[PDB]
Design a protein around this ligand. Structure first.
Ligand SMILES: *C(=O)CC(C)(C)SCCCCCCCCCCCC
Ligand SMILES: [Zn+2]
Lengths: 7, 295
């Protein structure tokens, strides 16, 4: 599952 | 021929009270909670991160999970400094409660972590907390994952005791999505179903600059009107980066409307058009008096 990144 | 008879708030209200409009998705960001005193935690122009040297830190590490799991103390000291004195939802929050009451709310997708949607009376099934929430916390050990309520977490934050699991003594973390963590599976499964069903997108208090949340506006059917209530125009295609983008002003505009001002005031204006002003005023005043009387 996609990870949270800046922006 | 388009669904809105004109590209204005008045056009949107007529469309909402027509039989064509039955299911509304709200997309909301920090702009709907600044009126309640909650700062925009993504903005470096809110003075939140000016006093971080005391934490002897490497900046963004304060919200990166890798750093947190090894040195949680800076995050919890910041959380104490910034903990709201009161949790009083705004006119905007209670407008979504009225949408729920009137059988129009399909889903509220929120970028916010402040729990005000729940305090205002939206239920878990109504909500996609795209970045998680402080409402609950969990032990971080994979074989445990004991859950803790905000009251328990608040008491640890204020007494300056690093929260630890009572069963296993691992660290306990608020259910916000730190940088480096997976985004919630519910965000993606709900998006795949809800946007097949939406008649109106209500976008309030977000500049639509954070991904993947901002990409939600391009998941709407081509015919679905999209109303932005926000202090500044947002969500248009970037003349440099270039597509689902908002088109408010071209000669090809057909479904997107911008109402530029404070979110509370835009929601007040829409409610007035709908015949809901008295209902909305009575609900806010009642809930606010209740919160103010908490003993
Ligand atoms: C992703 O974009 C989400 C963030 C990582 C930016 S949320 C950061 C939240 C920081 C909270 C600091 C302490 C505030 C305590 C408030 C508790 C009730 C909301
Ligand atoms: Zn545990």
């Amino acid at each position: 599952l996609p990870k949270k990144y800046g922006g | 021929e388009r669904l809105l008879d004109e590209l204005t708030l008045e056009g949107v209200a007529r469309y909402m009270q027509s039989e064509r409009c039955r299911r509304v998705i709200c997309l909301v960001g920090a702009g709907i909670s600044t009126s309640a005193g909650i700062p925009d935690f993504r903005s470096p122009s809110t003075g939140l991160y000016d006093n971080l040297e005391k934490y002897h830190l490497p900046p963004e590490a304060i919200f990166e999970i890798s750093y947190f799991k090894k040195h949680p103390e800076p995050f919890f000291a910041l959380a104490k400094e910034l903990y709201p004195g009161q949790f009083k939802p705004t006119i905007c929050h209670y407008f979504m409660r009225l949408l729920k009451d009137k059988g129009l709310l399909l889903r509220c997708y929120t970028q916010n972590i402040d729990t005000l949607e729940r305090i205002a009376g939206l239920e878990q099934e109504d909500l996609v907390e795209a970045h998680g929430t402080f409402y609950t916390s969990h032990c971080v050990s994979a074989s445990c994952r004991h859950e803790y309520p905000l009251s328990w977490m608040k008491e640890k934050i204020f007494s300056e005791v690093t929260p630890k699991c009572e069963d296993c003594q691992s660290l306990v973390k608020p259910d916000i999505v730190f940088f480096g963590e997976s985004l919630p599976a519910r965000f993606f499964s709900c998006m795949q179903s809800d946007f097949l069903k939406v008649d109106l997108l209500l976008v309030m208090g977000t500049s639509l600059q954070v991904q993947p949340f901002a990409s939600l506006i391009s998941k709407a059917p081509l015919s679905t009107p999209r109303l932005l209530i926000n202090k500044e125009k947002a969500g248009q295609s970037d003349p440099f980066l270039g597509g689902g983008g908002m088109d408010f002003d071209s000669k090809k505009a057909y479904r997107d409307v911008a109402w530029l001002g404070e979110c509370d005031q835009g929601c007040l204006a829409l409610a007035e058009l709908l015949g809901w002003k008295k209902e909305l005023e009575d609900l806010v005043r009642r809930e606010h008096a209740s919160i103010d009387a908490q003993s």
